Amino acid sequence: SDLELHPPSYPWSHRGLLSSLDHTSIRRGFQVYKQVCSSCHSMDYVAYRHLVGVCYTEDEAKALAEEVEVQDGPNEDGEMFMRPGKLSDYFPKPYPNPEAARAANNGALPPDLSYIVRARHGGEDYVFSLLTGYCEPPTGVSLREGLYFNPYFPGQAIGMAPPIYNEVLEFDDGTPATMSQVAKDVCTFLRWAAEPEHDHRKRMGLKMLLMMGLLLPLVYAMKRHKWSVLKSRKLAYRPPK
Amino acid sequence: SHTDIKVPDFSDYRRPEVLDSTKSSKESSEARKGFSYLVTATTTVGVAY
Amino acid sequence: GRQFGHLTRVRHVITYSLSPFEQRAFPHYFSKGIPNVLRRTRACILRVAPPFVAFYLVYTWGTQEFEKSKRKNPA
Amino acid sequence: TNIRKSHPLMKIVNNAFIDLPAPSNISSWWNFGSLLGICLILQILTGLFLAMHYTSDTTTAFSSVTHICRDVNYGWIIRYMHANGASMFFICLYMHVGRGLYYGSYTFLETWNIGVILLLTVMATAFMGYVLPWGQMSFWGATVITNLLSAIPYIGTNLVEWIWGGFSVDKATLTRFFAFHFILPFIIMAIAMVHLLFLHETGSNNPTGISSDVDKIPFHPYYTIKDILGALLLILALMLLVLFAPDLLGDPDNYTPANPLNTPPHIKPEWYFLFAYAILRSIPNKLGGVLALAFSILILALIPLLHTSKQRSMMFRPLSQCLFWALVADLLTLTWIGGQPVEHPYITIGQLASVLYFLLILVLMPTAGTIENKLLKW
Amino acid sequence: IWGGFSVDKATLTRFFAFHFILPFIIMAIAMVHLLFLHETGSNNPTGISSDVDK
Amino acid sequence: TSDTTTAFSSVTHICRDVNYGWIIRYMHANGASMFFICLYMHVGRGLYYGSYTF
Amino acid sequence: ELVDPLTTVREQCEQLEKCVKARERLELCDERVSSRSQTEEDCTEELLDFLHARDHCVAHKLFNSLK
Amino acid sequence: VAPTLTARLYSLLFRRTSTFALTIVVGALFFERAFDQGADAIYEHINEGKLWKHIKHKYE
Amino acid sequence: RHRTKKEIDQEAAVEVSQLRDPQHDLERVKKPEWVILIGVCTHLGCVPI
Ligand code: HEM
């Protein structure tokens, strides 16, 4: 309470400058979102189509969207039915009104995961460490067995249960799903939800450095060549007498 | 008396193709221009890209 | 206003110049280059550096005093 | 004769950047004027494209911005070039005001005052800019700041509600800011033309502070190319930020949609105001702080009357060189402080840097000048 | 210029933006109108030069 | 506000809720027409009087 | 019966010099607060230092094996 | 061969601002492509985190 | 806010003539166990924690 501890620096595979995202690791992370968080966490800004060029294929993406019932537009009777889910659909899930998060839990809003990595301080590092560094209370403070304990959290005391070892799983070519290995993934996915452009820019960035590494000296020499005339000018003063 | 006016030696700054008083600068003018123009040509190509 | 031809009055000064296509763009770039920069640095360190380290010291201290003020031992 | 010289349009261009007599002298510190110009059109160009998509209503404010970066093609580089361009704009702005003070360029009364107006203007422009995406910091930074005017006696209340369009930072308050943030950069640009008009009366000052009429060179090809090269550098800086560290200068808190009841603990303005923020809270008074914060920027207009040396530039004056960099360092302290919570060491050291800033400008620099004259038998 | 396959959402914000920036450019272009006009002065009802009675 | 959802709405909001938003709104609309009347008159004068020689 | 690289790595990391001293100071305070009643010097700080030293080293070694 | 290179380059392509321009535009074409190859090829070599994923999940 | 017996006694013990805006605690509440205020700071409108 009013004292804190800051996250370590985990060697993510996209922490490097010209470093792409692990897409295999974004899938696992997606799956981690679909079962676990998706019943408490909103992710309003990502859609099924967004996943297409990224992890899955066209068809794969469709079927995943088709595993929920939406609420397509009104028809003739001024109605509202329910629909298989297309691609144009986002991931708007849990509770309708905000307070429905509250009523379900106790106050406590499980903030949307569309922008989390970019919105805390310490990116995936803070989320990963909050997810992984779950621990037991030292002394002198009791919670309310509602407000679980967390060291990697402001006030070290607050709201969310550790659903990170409770294990679900579905890695086609398979991977063990420990608490840690399932955390890197939800985080490696959470980066991409907050910044889908991540990889593209770093490719341009590479071009930007390569280009500037050619243009810069080139323009210098152009400017050097024209100033030539002033750099080597010699003066002489020849007054009378 | 304006005849005492000689141009200061520039050897310190001249390109190597133009170091000899014995020889024409005509021979290397192309190459010298070639060089500097290639520099700008490439630049424009860069800026273009 | 402005314009060449009407700036000011000057007499008796000759200026020898050379075509850029006749000289090199980087004569002794490192040869005379580096010595100069050292010289310029030397010429200005005593005037530029001192306020900056003064900030630096006040920065690291001020930071330590902050962190160490938020803990308690006896009392 | 020559068309470039006599065509009613080209004349301008020609006498503004082609034949204009310029000192052979001016160094890199002189590049900031053109970079400020480039920053301006860049903010205008990307800013425009951002407006072809951004919608200005609380409901979609944040949303549209997200829509831009995800759906809108390349809306992300555009968005980031915009955000970072604003910072680049402030870096150059501060560098420009730096060069002026060090070199005595302020002896050009009108040119410089137009610059102060350029400062407040680009400043006022950017304050509104950042309220737009309707992030936590936007709303809150917008709340903290606007309210400041509520200290003005007998009228602060009425005034703050008047620019609010209500009793709080509401819907009225967002569309308003969009509109002004759109029209201000156009007025900035016209005022910048008058900056140049007035500057052209005298020509540029130079590193030595000595008149250079005796050694003037044409702006083209020398300063067209020295200006080209330095723009490329500004592109490097700018692109390094957007393509590698896009959020480095930005708060993560503005990535969370606004909430009028929330109130973050963290609460600071954008980096380019920290020094002024520091100065403001260093005073335990509503009116004091605000008055002092105003005096903090409006003092750029006092500078010319505080000139005391018999030399224009500081190049040949070491007591002043020392005092100058102390001033820079003291602003760096102010930046640092403003970014820290109002507690422990920080309070009093923040109050020290404040008095100092004012002592350094209002008394130490003028005095050093008189002494340096005395030392020269002048 | 539609921002799609029809006059959509893209098409409205676009027009707002341009309808905001165009009158500023209009004004600058109108200044050049006047600059050029001032070279000769105004014409007049008779079409005869009036330098003789300005 | 420039989004289809509130486009029309905001405009109505202007004339009913916004203080004097109605004169403003109408001066705007009519100003556009006045602008065209003068524009056409201006181009008229030019053609009749040969001002186009500039 | 699962492989928990975190726990595997935590053990060897949780050992090391830095961590012992913090865990030492922790238990010191632990018992200090345990053996007192009507006290409010609540032992939160000492836990954090232990975590820092531990978790810093946790990051350097972890992922290296993680699949 | 070396002096005559920059020389011939000036002779046949550089004097006339025409050819000088004809070449930079033509030179920008080939360059834009050859740069995008190498550049992307570089981006790939330091990665391999996507694309060869395709050979696995589909192929139908 | 529901104030405990302890907080009520503490505000009653405050040296009133030293205050920036002189007011006794009992003229700012109706029931001593309840304090109701607008979450708006008198300086520049932020919300007090
Ligand atoms: C892998 C799935 C999940 C992830 C990645 C996730 C991650 C997060 C993160 C990063 C925060 C905000 C941390 C902060 O404020 O600094 C959060 C808050 C919260 N989430 Fe989760 N969580 C997940 C599943 C759950 C589940 C299953 C629940 C239901 C117990 C839950 C309920 C909460 C609540 C109540 C909070 C608010 C904490 C508070 O402010 O007191 N989330 N979560």
Ligand code: HEM
């Ligand atoms: C809208 C931002 C500004 C722009 C676009 C702008 C544009 C320029 C340009 C193009 C120059 C040409 C010469 C040079 O850069 O040294 C210049 C010089 C100058 N500006 Fe600015 N300026 C801006 C803000 C300022 C500010 C904030 C000030 C000071 C309050 C200022 C006062 C001056 C002065 C005094 C000079 C003369 C410099 C000298 O000759 O040494 N201007 N400016």
Ligand code: HEM
């Ligand atoms: C008239 C040209 C300009 C237009 C049309 C424009 C329009 C916009 C719009 C619509 C936004 C919200 C979308 C977004 O945040 O990405 C924005 C953000 C902003 N722009 Fe401008 N603006 C212009 C000139 C400026 C100028 C002169 C500055 C000052 C350097 C400026 C600095 C900002 C800032 C600080 C923000 C908010 C921070 C952010 O990017 O998230 N822009 N602008």
Ligand code: HEM
């Ligand atoms: C943006 C709308 C325009 C503005 C603000 C504008 C402004 C002016 C002004 C202030 C004058 C001064 C003398 C006078 O009115 O007779 C003028 C004259 C003139 N304008 Fe325009 N004008 C505009 C559109 C036009 C158009 C549409 C044309 C024809 C295509 C035009 C061609 C002329 C000419 C030829 C004159 C000279 C008139 C004469 O001396 O008889 N301008 N304008």
